[PDB]
Amino acid sequence: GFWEEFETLQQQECKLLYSRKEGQRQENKNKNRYKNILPFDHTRVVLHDGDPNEPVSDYINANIIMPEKSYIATQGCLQNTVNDFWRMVFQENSRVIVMTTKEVERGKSKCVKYWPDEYALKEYGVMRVRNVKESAAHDYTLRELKLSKVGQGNTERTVWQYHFRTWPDHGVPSDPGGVLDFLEEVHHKQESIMDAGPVVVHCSAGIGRTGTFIVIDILIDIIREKGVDCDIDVPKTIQMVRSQRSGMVQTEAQYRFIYMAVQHYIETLQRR
């Protein structure tokens, strides 16, 4: 229909109104892993309550992703943004973190370690984190973290870090079963926590693997609500997440993996 075709064209020009100015500020240069991968201003996570000695303390390379449960899509920490990451988790009341990379893959730093070892605690600026217990699953490790603001023990909350460990160094997994099982656990944990904030998801840039995990999670949530017969539109979902953070889902293999994951999920429901 003409209405449909034209509206579709018009929606595609909306992104010309987005800006990425905050991420290009001189003070924020050293807070981006990739100079060309920056958060949209209108969905970026804005950090309040930073060190007043820092001229710019409100910036992290992260965006809120609301399907239209919400998400924060962010890059893996740099050595200098670990304190900022924990400020974000506290402020947003996030209770679940999904780490989709190893710290180092193929000689490259994807994420600086931002958690304490099991049974230890660390202060990251004003934030105190205790690692109470770790559980090693086949494809991932779960770390039960307790996060609080120093001098305010009453603010302590549990943050569950789901660290996916077996994504391959090149390409995507050749079967989606491990990812789906992982995502099912993340889903049940989030739904168990009253007033939990957005689920934090990261990879080195916060777009490729992050986007893949987020898009799969959104689609399987639709299938949970609407059943295996519901309509699914992968391209419209990717367009909706890309309106909130540019570039989500970076490769054709990632794109195919999303399709495979959704179909596998449907078949699991038919088997169970």
Residue numbers in the entry: 246 to 313, 325 to 528
Anything the authors wrote about it?
In the first category are TCPTP, SHP1, SHP2, BDP1, LYP, PEST, PTPBAS, DEP1, MEG2, and GLEPP1, which have a “PTP1B-like” accessible pocket that harbors a basic residue corresponding to Arg24 of PTP1B. This pocket has the potential to accommodate pY at the +1 position as in PTP1B or potentially other acidic or phosphorylated residues in positions N-terminal to the substrate pY. The new structural data and analysis presented here suggest that a secondary substrate-binding pocket, similar to that found in PTP1B, is present also in SHP2, BDP1, LYP, SHP1, TCPTP, MEG2, PTPBAS, DEP1, and GLEPP1. A similar inhibitor design strategy may also be used in the design of inhibitors of SHP2 for cancer (Chan et al., 2008) and may now be applied to a much wider subset of PTPs. PTPs with particularly high enzymatic activity against generic substrates were RPTPσ and PTP subgroups R5, R3, NT1, NT2, NT3, NT4, and NT5. The subgroups NT1, NT2, NT3, and NT5 exhibited a pronounced preference for acidic residues N-terminal to the phosphorylation site.
Protein tyrosine phosphatases (PTPs) play a critical role in regulating cellular functions by selectively dephosphorylating their substrates. The ∼280 residue PTP catalytic domain consists of an α/β structure, and biochemical and structural studies have led to a detailed understanding of the catalytic mechanism (Barford et al., 1994; Zhang, 2002). Key features of the domain include the PTP signature motif, the mobile Trp-Pro-Asp “WPD” loop that in the closed conformation positions the conserved and catalytically important aspartate residue, and the phosphotyrosine recognition loop. Here we report the crystal structures of 22 PTP domains, including two tandem-domain RPTP structures and a detailed structural comparison of this protein family.
